[PDB]
């Protein structure tokens, strides 16, 4: 909890963006949200060509894989039949997503590095320390290691891309940790009920537990709205967006 | 019209 106010976010040195799955894929499930994806890549490249050391934790590989595999299944039927999986989709989606990120980042000079982790990799101490060394070595060379879960051969208290992001932010000792989710923030009761209020400053449920854990270890977690324009640039810019987590 | 109706959608493209 080094930071304590939304003006001390200008001096965040190492932040860990975390893209949800509602951010990348659209509601139609007919492609990507290329607008939001390219805008987030633009903001990350602009806040990384500035001096900070950012390292995204992407997500939403299975959705891309589902789209690609549905197309391949349609395009491989007999015209007699036309007139009347987690892992395969994860593999296809991971390949395609890294290709897209690579193109969008190389348009800015930056370089990315796909680092896929699993769940047991956080249990074995040797592997965990080796992974920390790898991540620090990648960050110090001005690379943007785009972490993700090895969902193609072993699908997954790490149980998501959220708790994994909190663990990474705790281990790599990051200042900020942006949990770009689908909701606009945190309320004391869901919007379709009484008491609709935003909790801009959090005093002292999965996202909430992950944020609490990462707050009790040095990081300062922020939960933003993914479908909001200019999320990261204003979260860092100091404006009151999302719900900031301090004591 | 007896064969081409029983090809995969990929071959006929």
Numbering used by the authors:
A (entry chain A): 45 to 128, 141 to 212, 229 to 276, 296 to 338
B (entry chain E): 115 to 127
Quoted from the paper:
The bifunctional enzyme Δ1-pyrroline-5-carboxylate synthase (P5CS) is vital to the synthesis of proline and ornithine, playing an essential role in human health and agriculture. The P5CS molecule contains two domains, GK and GPR, catalyzing the first and second steps in the biosynthesis of proline from glutamate. The GK domain catalyzes glutamate phosphorylation, and the GPR domain catalyzes the NADPH-dependent reduction of γ-glutamyl phosphate (G5P) to glutamate-γ-semialdehyde (GSA). Our results describe the assembly mechanism of P5CS filaments, in which the GK domain forms tetramer and the GPR domain forms dimer structure, and both domains form specific interaction interfaces.
In the P5CSGlu/ATPγS filament, the ligands could not be determined due to incomplete densities. The GK domain structure of the P5CSGlu/ATPγS filament is virtually identical to that of the P5CSMix filament. We speculate that there are two ligand-binding modes (bound with Glu-Mg-ATPγS and G5P-Mg-ADP, respectively) in the P5CSGlu/ATPγS filament. These two modes may coexist in the active sites of the GK tetramer, thereby affecting the 3D reconstruction of the structures. The unexpected presence of G5P could be due to the contamination of ATP in the commercial ATPγS (80% pure) and all substrates were in excess during our sample preparation. Thus, no ligand was modeled in the GK domain structure of the P5CSGlu/ATPγS filament. In P5CSGlu/ATPγS and P5CSMix filaments, the additional interface between hook structures pairs locks adjacent GK tetramers.
